[PDB]
Amino acid sequence: LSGGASINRIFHERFPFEIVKMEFNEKELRREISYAIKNIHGIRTGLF
Amino acid sequence: TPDMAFEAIVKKQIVKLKGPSLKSVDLVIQELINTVKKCTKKLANFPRLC
């Protein structure tokens, strides 16, 4: 396999996949968010 | 929607209660000073005391 053809694979196959691979761990992420919204508000109240 | 914009407008409105509120104190001071002057007509016979 040639070098340049591989580069296309790097750009359009590897890079996307490397990105997809980094897990969100969303349950722990959602916690981060909820903590985040309480902290911006905090000492102020509610809406919006 | 800006949480702080709500607060901003309200704080403007609340400040506007200083006028009618101070005025109220004066209207009370007026009635109070009138009353002490009303009562002291019963003590008018003594000029220096009244």
Swiss-Prot record, chain B:
Cell compartments where the protein resides: Cytoplasm; Cytoplasm, Cytoskeleton
Lineage top rank: taxon: Eukaryota
Similarity comment: family membership: Belongs to the TRAFAC class dynamin-like GTPase superfamily. Dynamin/Fzo/YdjA family.
Function: Microtubule-associated force-producing protein involved in producing microtubule bundles and able to bind and hydrolyze GTP. Most probably involved in vesicular trafficking processes, in particular endocytosis.
Name of the protein: Dynamin-3
Lineage: Eukaryota, Metazoa, Chordata, Craniata, Vertebrata
Name of the gene encoding the protein in the UniProt record: DNM3
